[PDB]
Amino acid sequence: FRQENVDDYYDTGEELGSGQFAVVKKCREKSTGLQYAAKFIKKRSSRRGVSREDIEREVSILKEIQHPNVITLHEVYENKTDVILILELVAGGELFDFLAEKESLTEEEATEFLKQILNGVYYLHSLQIAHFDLKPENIMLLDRNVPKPRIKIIDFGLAHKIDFGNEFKNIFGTPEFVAPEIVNYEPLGLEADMWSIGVITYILLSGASPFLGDTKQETLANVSAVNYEFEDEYFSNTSALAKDFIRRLLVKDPKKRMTIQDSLQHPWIKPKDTQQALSRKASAVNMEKFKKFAARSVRLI
Ligand SMILES: [Mg+2]
């Protein structure tokens, strides 16, 4: 990690964000004039700060990843109190906020945006990296003011390189979005991201959250038992192909769940014939419900 003062290389401005042991400022690199985001992460052994091990794992994954749909790490600095990630400036806001500004969305147009999400995940999974926190607030746009906005997956704070010879178990993430193996403290791997893609998709089409209960206890029980329905109220204009794609992801047994590669060949994403393309063209997002959803931190432990 770079030992120089980040201020010698960057001018820093306004706060873009803050979470528990971090703050994000917009910054401009002095030698090039280009803008980035600088995330200052408080170093911890002490119940304040992020552990060295977690900081290093997240940085080691960011340094590896280079793909148009995943946020890029520029440089990393360190002083006595922080680690500072200089990151690509991802300034278009959340995908669902952007989609909720539109009047309508066919299933065909929704798959367009989903496909960029699938391609970023396809790349991560091909490097044996599980993201482990896929949910709408981690799916952003690079710049909303262009003909075809680019999706960026962000926030690799929970990402792990999958180790063939050693099971990984942990309890983390947001209850609405975590796979049953996370709720049951079972072996975790790439499949958990696939389940969360199923949840993002179900919400994208309906504006409803599939497993959400009135309490945290109920949500977790719903997740663990895979207890969800496609209610007519929300899903009466959704194609059978959509619902099949979701059904193939929201699967208790991780070995039976569709993989990223399968997902990208699914006929709802890649129709094999005219009939399938027409079925997709005839269905559309429940935009009135989806707008309420977009207009509405939360942790497993
Ligand atoms: Mg986030």
Residue numbers in the entry: 4 to 47, 51 to 302, 308 to 312
Task: Cite, word for word, the article reporting this structure.
Members of the DAPK family are generally involved in both apoptotic and autophagy pathways and share significant overall sequence similarity with myosin light chain-related kinases and triple functional domain protein-related kinases (Temmerman et al., 2013). DAPK1 and DAPK2 bind Ca2+/CaM through a closely related ARD, which is inhibited by phosphorylation of an identical ARD residue Ser308 in both kinases (Shani et al., 2001, Shohat et al., 2001). They also contain a basic loop (BL) in the kinase N lobe next to the kinase active site, which has been identified as a DAPK-family-specific signature motif (Tereshko et al., 2001). We found an identical type of dimer arrangement in all three kinases that involves the BL of the CD. In terms of functional implications, CD dimerization in hDAPK1, hDAPK2, and hDAPK3 is likely to inhibit catalytic activity by directly occluding the kinase active site.
To explore the molecular mechanisms involved in human DAPK regulation, we expressed and purified truncated versions of hDAPK1, hDAPK2, and hDAPK3. Both the hDAPK1 and hDAPK2 constructs encompass the CD and ARD segments. All three kinases were crystallized and the resulting structures were refined to a resolution of 2.0 Å (hDAPK1), 1.47 Å (hDAPK2), and 3.1 Å (hDAPK3). The dimeric interface areas are in the range of 930–1,600 Å2 in size. This area is smaller in the DAPK1 dimer than in the DAPK2 and DAPK3 dimers, as we were unable to model most of the BL region in this kinase due to weak electron density. By contrast, for hDAPK1 there is a substantially higher level of diversity in terms of possible arrangements. Several other hDAPK1 PDB entries are even monomeric. This is supported by a comparative SEC experiment under the conditions we have established here showing that hDAPK1 tends to be considerably more monomeric than hDAPK2. An analysis of the level of specific dimeric interface interactions indicates an almost complete lack in the hDAPK1 dimer, compared with those found in hDAPK2. Therefore, we speculate that the inhibition of CD-mediated homodimerization of hDAPK1 may have a less pronounced role in regulating hDAPK1 activity than other family members. The highly conserved pattern of four positively charged BL residues in DAPK1 and DAPK2 is suggestive of a common CD-mediated Ca2+/CaM-binding site in both these kinases.
